[model samples]
Every structure is written in structure tokens, then in C-alpha cells.
Target: PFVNKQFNYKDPVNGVDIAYIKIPNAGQMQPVKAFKIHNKIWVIPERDTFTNPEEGDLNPPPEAKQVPVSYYDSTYLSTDNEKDNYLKGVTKLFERIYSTDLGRMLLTSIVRGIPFWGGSTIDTELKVIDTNCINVIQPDGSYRSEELNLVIIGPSADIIQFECKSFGHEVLNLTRNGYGSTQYIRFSPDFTFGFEEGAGKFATDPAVTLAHELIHAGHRLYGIAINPNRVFKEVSFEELRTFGGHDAKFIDSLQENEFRLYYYNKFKDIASTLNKAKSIVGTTASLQYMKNVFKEKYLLSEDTSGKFSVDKLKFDKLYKMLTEIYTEDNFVKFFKVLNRKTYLNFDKAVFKINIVPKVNYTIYDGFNLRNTNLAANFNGQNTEINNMNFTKLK
Candidate 1:
């Protein structure tokens, strides 16, 4: 007989050896003691726990990375007791979901496309700022203001000063660093959702929203390039502004769609379960509304496959055309166009040979044109947009 020692692998934040296993039809993960023969291998619940009694010891172990989640918000506008309780409740929810195997996998998958610049251990800081009496600008250049609920802040040089409003309130713009530097993440009071003991159905669940914004945070912190071809280190509002707002809008679309695809591929059921929990004890309209929130936050729209609208149900369209083809390709092309720096006011060229698709084009183009006869093309011909073609000709 071999000597068996039960070594408990303690959680770093909680200092407990019990692994929380997610149960069926249950809204939360339940804590369970795991036993390793000799080594201290932490067995996660969702991947390891088998549901059917007949299929015992046949489940695959979960492969996951450890990531930390932190929250910080002020109580300036709100009363002391309310702020304290809100923070506590939000903290509980964050730990409950992120402390499990499924949660970690989903969060990790969100930033998998990001390049490896820093540690894999994800440390997300969520904050909620108060804009109690700030004068916020509307989209139509008119100024209107009110007490805004929740908004995610970039808190960096590139985006923080690029100033915009969320839910029609001017968010606080603070300097984390001087300029052209990366920043962290923040959340709002409206982030909390689902049924609580005292506060039933806080009306909005920001889980999916949190994941989406966190991707941007991951980009800034770790220099995770969104484009498949690593042409750029980080995508920012400053760069996006160079080619008008189209680039920025498309980038948002890409990131949002990417996050939605990841969530559906991995944690769709968990998301649905949470939404259902928020829906129960409410009306049919409320249920539908909650479902809509889930769909909007986590699911793709019916009208678009990538960026083009397709005729299909929202669920059907997403399942069928979930490759994000248009978004990714559009992103690549947009980045390339910006990289060329030709989208701006450029000199007309007489004899131009455009390099279609070479793997080393940016480098090659820069090298060849930087030193060689580059102005000969624009010297001879007076280029004009004519002959029913959008090209510069003789």
C-alpha cells in the first residue's frame, strides 16, 4: 500500500484549500475539498467534476491560468453605508465567478490574442467615479447633465483626453501618466446586477461589459495587438483618429465581436444561467429585457455577420457566421492603410506600382522608397480621378 497525503492547494486571495465547483441549475460555484495523492494539484470543479454517475473518472481536468480581479470606486456622491454595502456585494460576485475554473478560462480567452509583454497573471482594476454635477456634452453639441450611473474609464493619455460621454455624463479625465502611455480599467455603480438578498434584480449585469472593456485594458497594459498580423504593438484612439472615426468604430466592433465570440464559444451556458437568475420572479417583459441585455452585451446581432447584415435570426446568424471575417480583415486593412500613412494628404504619383500582398511589405517599401527614386512617379503625370475608375492616371 502506498502512503497518501492530502495536500490542500490554497487560493492566493482567500487562503482556502477548497475548490469551488459549479453545480447544475445553481447560480454560483460551491466550495469542495479536493484530494491529491501526493502533489498539490488544484482540481477545478467545472472541468473535473462528472455529472453522471455512470461515467465516473472519465472527465478531463481543466487547464487554466490564474488571474487577479480588483475593484475600486468612490463614495463621494453617495452615502457612506450604501457605498460600503455596494462594494462588498460587488466584491463577492467578482470572487464567486472569477475564482472558479470556467471563469478563469473565459477571462483568459478574452486576452489570448494580446501579445506577451508582461505576466500572464491578469490584474484588472475596476473603478466607479462620481460625476455628480459635471456639465456633459451631448452628441449634437448641446450641453446637458445629470447624475450618471456607471461608466468605464480609460484613464490614459491617448483616450482619456479624447473625451467622450457615457449615458450622457462627462466622465472624469485624470492623468495616470503624462501622455502616449497605457492605462488601467474602471467600472461604474450600475455594473452590479441579478438578485441579491435585499436588492432584488439591480436591473443590469455588467459581466459581459466588464470582459469587453478589460480586453482594451489588457491591450494597453500588455501591448496586445488586436490585428492578426502583428504590424502594430497597440491600437489606440490617437492612431484611430488619424484615419477619421471609421477606424475607431471598426476597432470597437472588432473587439466587441471578438469578445462575444469567445464568450459564446466557452461560457454561453453560464451566461444564460446568470441571465435566467436575473429574469426569475419578474414579468415576461422583464425576462425578455434581461435576455436582450444578455444578447446585446454578450451575443452578436442578427443584422450582421461580421459587419455585413445577413438574413437570419440573431442566434442562427451568430452560430453560422461567427468567424468575424469582415471585422478581422477590415482591421488588418485599416491598420495597413494607416501604416502606409497615405490616407492623409499625399503627393500625386505618375508611375506607381502598388505592392499588393507581400509579407515584408512595410519593411521593404520603407527601405526601397526611403533611399531610392521615389518622386519620379509623381513628377511626370497629372493624376486625376476619372474614366469611371478611382485611380490616378496620365
Candidate 2:
């Protein structure tokens, strides 16, 4: 059924048959995906098949108004034979992200950094990863995992630029918050862990790791665009100096670690602030319909009780699937009523409230305090520190 030909469905209202190329496979033999847009259908070619779209050419589906394609860095910097691995890994990863509902939502939701647009001169600088970190050859043609690790970077003021050898260098020009107009997603040194052939262990499909990374990234992107108190470091933006000198100078800006320390110093305060705001909130009747239909679609529950909860492990997947869609623009542009099967009036309205979602995803995070100097602040035994995780705050 996934590779069927001559499959046609008749539109009940119009009594007309809408025919398309073929399922799963585009006419050219490359992969293609179809999405149900109200009573219509939309199909698009998969990644890398798009006839070399510059580098960061972001195009929403022809039928879609919101929810742009996920942002990824595709410099193809380390050219020639070996670098093919990097590109293939990324291409495969994009397919995987499109493959699942949750995967789809997170990547779609991921945001690019907000441009500063100070109307001032912007100076740029170059930063290269130490060569020792990537695709090392052990003289015998054997390979080792690249030493540097990063996936997605953005949604902060300093515009944290993570480094990796194989991926090449970055231009440190804070056109936007830090990314100028566009930012990149790493998905591991080269999306290695995202590939089927990689060294890693986790509780779910490895794409979850990729999705998990995207989950953080989407919230951070949204969080930063809305409220990034970025660390200017020594020089303020008023003076218009470029960022980055020593590696440590960039640490508090690193997305995986300290950047949140500077950008989201009030990270925990989100929950606190939300708790207060809980007394008042709003939503879209159209969004809730889709959210309800899709949310319960994967999460099968027989419990008819007032309260329901899936396993956190299971819910994570569900959350991604649900999270994949929320952009109100998507509904207004592509959908009027979610098809004939269920002629629900899916009108336009805010899909999700802005304030709470960002908080739920980026805030309430922590780091393991194992064998670190900060352990001294805790008067605990060695064993105790091993189990202790430090939560960052301003």
C-alpha cells in the first residue's frame, strides 16, 4: 500500500477524483510525502532531492502558509569523498524527522533567531573547530567518533555558536540575536547518532534523540525570539563589537550548557510566572480539535475516567507528535474543515498560547554534579554528589 500505483480517491462533495503521481515515491523515484489539506492534498519531494537549494533555502510547503521547513546548516564545507557521509546522514535524518508525527511537529516548530535590526554596522568574525575533533583516521582506515558533540544552537542573545571539526567553521556575526537571520541545527557532529549505523543508546527510537534535541531547540528558539536577555559579555551591543575571543567567553552562550544561564536566567521563573497566569489563559477551538484528534490518535487509552496519563516514556513521543503542529497559520492557509471523514469546522485561531509552551520545554532543566568543583558548595558525601544534579539560575 505504501508503494501503490493508480490509487485514486473520489471527493464526496465535488464527486471528482483527484489523482497524483504515486504513493511514497515521487515520479522521479525519490521519496515524496503527502499531507491532507482540508479537502485537498499536497505532495512534496524529500530532502536533498530539491535540486540543490542554495544552503539555507527555507520553503514552506507550497500549500502551507506557516510552519516552515526545519532549519539546518548544509554548508557541505568539508568537501570531497569523506564528507558525503555527513550529507547522507543529514538527508536521512530529515526523512526520519518527516516520518513521524512528533518528529514533524518539533522540526516545524523550531524557530530561527530574531534579527537585531539595530540599523548599526555589524562586524563579522570566523571561528574554527580544533582539527583533532572530527572523523579521525587511525592510519589503518578505521574511524572514530568525532570528539565534538552538538545538535541545535539558537534562541539566545549571545547567539551561541557551537563548534565541531568536520562541520567546518562559523561566521560569528549577530545579524539576528546571534545567527543574523538564520541558525543551524547540528544533530550530532554530522547527525551520526541519528543514523541507523551509529554508537549510542537510549530508551526510544534514536530519532527521539534527534527529536529530543529539536524539542529543546524549538522552545529555545521561541523563547529567545520572545525574551532573550543575551549576554553581551565585555562589550555591549551599543558599542557594536563582535562576539567571541577565548572559548570560555562563548561558554555562557553555549546552547547545551551555560547560555541559558545568561539568556534564561529567569528560566525557572517561567513555571512560577505561569502558575500565577494560570488563573487566566486562552486557546483556539480549531487547534484544540486537531490537537485532540492527533493527540489521542497515537495514545490509545481505554480509560474513560476524568484523569488520564500515559507513561512518560510513551508521552514523550505523543508530545512530539502533538507539538509538531501548533502554528495557527498552517490551519488558516491550508485547512478549512479537516476533510470529509470528519467535517469538523477547523477555523483559524491561535493554536497554542505563547507564554507557557516555551517555559515547559526550555526551563526546569539541570546538570549532573558529578566530580565538579561546584560540589564543594554542597556539604554532601562523594556518593551523594554523584546523585545530585545542579539546577542553573541567575
Candidate 3:
């Protein structure tokens, strides 16, 4: 038998660097294996069980509980009511995004089509309600099928598992959860709800993780085709400061995500606050409310990345000019689009994060919106399927 070559992968987000062997099956970077090595159990191939002197030893005790990873898949099913609940919940929020004027603007480009490999293209009004792959590349391309192959870990799948949990991407920080990349997205019983909308109040929390991950997919799909370099650069473990990287050299990628989270959080904060009053009444009234609030409470501040500046007066001038040229609605539309915008430049093979629109062929507006009667808000951690049956991973 030929020996499989080992490739070292660092979690782009953060955490301990990993040394892995690729089996080239399903294009997934995850390996198949079982052993109780820690409190949490992610998959690890049997071949990796042996202690590598260079990587260090597992130091397993003489007797350890062996885990069976077969049940990992079915734990998260479209049939699972909890899963369905979250799916429908996410779908509605996505739909509400279209409720905005920016929705029409984005729909136009999507209808035309977005580029893909081989002159063939993929487009999406994306009717999807689940979270899956964020990588959208080779092995993790499972999200492309529009079926949820998402293996929801936590509380459940840990019974018989091996692999030490280390620095992970968008890694590290408790909230990060490697929200993208890899074939699977983890789930917890608890939901962190964040909603913002005045005329249209919708919970953004249930869909935040999915939307954030999808942004990575669409951005990278075009980006890799254009330049073939990782959209997010990876840094050395030292670059992680004894921390992470050197992949697709993704340290830079994760940092870009940090920038995204920073902006997204800021975006939601203002939106959430605006929605608190329930409704802003008429258009002019809404503008007055937003402008005043923005001026007094949430004026654009400086960011370390130097992308945004502390321009209180500049923002006021632009807001006034935009309101004059169009209406206050246009400015609001642009702001919403900015969070969800993309510019695919084939001439230069670049996918710039800007105001042009593109189609998301995967999971756009394509799931059952009915029969999922879960509440609008996802307040608690989803429950597990006990004494449940699941189809095993081949």
C-alpha cells in the first residue's frame, strides 16, 4: 500500500497548528477516526492515532473510551424539527433582506448570472435555510449541492472521538467558532439573537452565522478563480505569535474576517437600536431619527485598519448631499448593500469587496419556508435528537 503524504494545516482563525494527512475522499480535509483524547471530539483518522515524535505524543492512557463517529451526519437533518426551525428562521430574515430597495438592485445582477468555472456560470436568488460549507472550494464544496451536509457537533457527537481541540479559525475566541471553511458548521443549544429593522423587524442572530459564512464562500469563489491565491493570507504560527497560520497562509484572511465582524457588529448595533422604537413612521421622520441618532450616538469612528476614518462632519455632509440627490432611503439602501456586496472583476481576475452585485447559486431562496413554525427569535440552544437514527458516513 502506498503511504499517504501528510500536509500541515493551520486554522486560519487561530489556535494550535495541525499536522494532517489527506485521504482525498469527498475533498474534505477532515480525517476518519475514533478515540477519547479530550473533552470535545472532532474527527481524526486512525492513522493519526500513532504519536509522531516530531508532532509530539498523544500520551493516551492504557485504557481509553473508544468513540464511534458514524452518527455524526444524522444528528443534523433537515427532518430534525430544530434544524428545520432554524432553517426557516434564517430563510425569513434572508427574504426580508430582499424587502429592501437594495434587494431589487442585487436581484438584477443575479438574474443576469454570476461567473463560475468553464464559462458555465452559477446564479442564485438563494432560497436556502441551512448552514453548511463556508470554504466553497474543492473538499468543502459540499455547500454547492444545496443539501445540508452540515454535521452539527457539540453535546452529541463527542461520545467516541479523538483529536485535541486546539487553535481553530476565524479561530480562537469563543465566539469565532470557525464559522466558515471546512465542510461542517457546529451548532449549540443556545442562540445569540441580534435583530435590527424598524419598518421590518427581523432577528438577525439566527441567520448571522450562515450569512457571515456565505460571504466568505461567494467572495473566495470568484477571488480564487481570479488570482488563485487565498483571499485571506495565512501567517506562520509565530505570526499567530506562537498562534496560527501559514496556509493558503490564512492569517490575513482571518484578520479580514475580523474586519468584517467589526463592521458587521457596528452595523447591527445601529440597526438594532433603530428598531427599538418599533417604527420610525414616515420617510422624513425616519431620516430625522436616523440622522440625529447617528450624529449623537453612533457617528462613524476610526478603525485601526485605516479603512474608516473619524469623519463626523464628512459623514454629515455626505448624508445631506445623498438625501438631497435622492431620498434618505437611498443612503440606507446603500448601507445595507455594503454589508452584503461584491464586485467580481474577471478582467483582472479579482473579486473586490464593493458595491457591485453577484449571484449566489447555492442555497438562495430554495428551501421549505412553510411547515417550519419555529418562532421568529432563536433564544435557546437547540436540543439533541435522542435515541435517534442516522445514516453513517461512508
Candidate 4:
């Protein structure tokens, strides 16, 4: 019998749904496992394929967002057709995956849950500028020589540009981070593994990645200050102690929580504005609500027992299900609550401060190695490296 994991449901509708999943052994159209209750399934396959550009132009528009650009490279790059097709394919993958509604939700949620009031509010308007090609500089003054540009408009206006590079999963453990007003959506070249097709598959990975980064942009614009040290990343640690204080008095003065409140307020405002735009995607909480809810619900599950023991494999599974919610219609309804901006960004980061949650979703979520163990940490040999150890800081 297939083993079933138990889930603690606060909402009556929580459970598996039907969707397509890639079977390891089979190539196509296999009877695969899936979440049954909420109509959750993996990727749904369409039989149609594009043999050439003329063929593509003749068809109706796709279900997902399609960023169109006439091929200019002229060298015939793609193995499928000309080199321009490859470039276009890659560009489509970057835009579709990198720009997601779900990511907007997570950022809004995290910012709102901060439980403080600072003067700043999340700036929702992203100033779209003319695209440009630039070098991706390395830490040592080197470059990847990639011709990428920023798509979303930002508070900084159209001055500095950003890259939406699609290396995919080739970059390991690469978490989403930002510098200055510019940010990059760096992904591995192989993100298609989780899907039925493959990397650049059906516009899924880029959608999720965009969701993450856009949420990050939402955080940056509104100055949503998270307690960085608490997260254990070397980068976040610097941010926490440097920007947000560990001591209550220091934190109180900085109004870090208040700052978050402002961001959430802004998130609501922008989401509302975006909802008005008929051109944009479904008018759900502007994508920020998805992120905001994740931390509040799953990542913030309170532990009654002091031991902090948890079922991580089950938690990870649940998390995957929870994240599969981009296409959910109910999420649109949740956006309405965000209209009230004044109460935004005012919740505690975690329900039980002293006792940590079982699953820390992001690299930014700090280490809690002292209390319990998790399955994901061990190597094949079975040596232990606490979750905190994996953070940017040791």
C-alpha cells in the first residue's frame, strides 16, 4: 500500500488535488500520483508542438503569460529552428517563470507579519523601462557576458537595469537576494526536473521564481526590515544586526515592525491598483498574499511540546502542496483583506518565539540547531550539519 502522511488542517479545504506529475520511469501520459482533494495535479500536457515561428504565430495565444519579441539574432540559434528561436524560447522561459503572481503573495505576507510600525511603506509601482544588455559582474570583477535586462519597473525609475538570467538549477543552493535597487532572478539551467516535461517546461519554474523575486522587490521598496540574525544567513545576519536590532529597545527605536506594517499596507495598496488593471493577471492579492500566507500558516506552526520534534518529510510534502496554490481562485478573495493597509505588517514573525517552527522555508529563515533534528540535513554517510550551518553564516 502507498504510505499516506497526516496533515494538520486549519482550513476545511486543505488536502491533495488532482494534477499531472512526471513519472520517473515513464516518458509520457503515465498514471501518476497526485493530490486528490483540492484538484491538485502536476503539469497538464498539451499535445500541440511548435515546428516553426510561422506555425507559432498562426495559433491562438497560450493560457499563461507570453512575452513576445521578434527574433533579431539572425544566426539561427535554436536546434528546433533558427538560433533566434532558442533565444526566444530562453527569453520566454525567463519571463514566464521569473514573473509570477504567487511570489508577490509571500513577500506581502512576510512583511505584514512583522508586528511593528516603521515610517516606510511597500512601494508597489514598478517603473518598466526600455530593456538593455549589460554584463553580469562577478565578485572578482569578472562577467558572465550574458545580455540580460530588467523587465519590471521600480521605485528607482528606469536608471539602473537588472538581469533575469535563466541558468536554471545549474546554480545550486542559489537563494534569491538583492543589492541596491537592482535584483536578479538567477536560476539553474535544469529546473525542469520537478515537472513532467523538463527545464523551461510549461512556464512553471520561471513563474515561481518571479513570484519570489517580486516579493523581494516588494520588501525592498517598502523597507520591510526582518530580523536578519534570527535567520542565520551570513547576509541576513549582517542585515539583522546592522539594520534591525536584536534587543527590544534597539528594535523598538528602529520601528522595524512598523516598517513592515507600512510595507504590508503598501502591498495592499499596489495589489488593489494592479487588480484594477485589466491587462495584468488575475486580480488576486497582487501575488504578495501568497508569500504572506505561507510564513503565517505553515512556517509559523506553533509547537506545543517543548521538544520541537516534527515530521519534516510530511512538512515538506505539505509545503509543496501549499505552494502549488498560484492557480487557486480563492487566493483572489484573500487579496481584499489587504486593502486595509494601516494594520499591515504587525504580526510576530513566528507564533512561538522561543520554540521554532519545524520547517524554515527560506535561506533567510534562521538556524534552530540546538533543539531538534531534520531529515534534509544529513548526507548519505549520515553525518549531521545543523540547519543553521547551511545558512550564509556558519
Residue-level lDDT of model 1, residues 14-47, one tens digit each, is: 2222223221212233333222111111222111
Give the per-residue lDDT digits (tens) of candidate 4, residues 209-320. 3343443433332233243444332344213232221212222434544433443343343334333322212233343443333234223232443111224454444323
Q: lDDT per model, in order?
A: 0.26, 0.26, 0.25, 0.25
lDDT: which candidate is best? 1
21-51 in candidate 3: lDDT tens per residue?
A: 2322233344321111111112222222122
Clashes of each: 3, 9, 30, 68
What does each candidate score in C-alpha RMSD? 26.6, 23.7, 22.7, 22.1
TM-score of each: 0.22, 0.24, 0.24, 0.22
Worst 10 residues of 4 by lDDT: 153-162
TM-score of 4: 0.22
Candidate closer to the true structure by TM-score (higher is better), 1 or 2: 2
Better of 1 and 3 by TM-score: 3
Residue 357 miss distance in model 4 (angstroms): 41
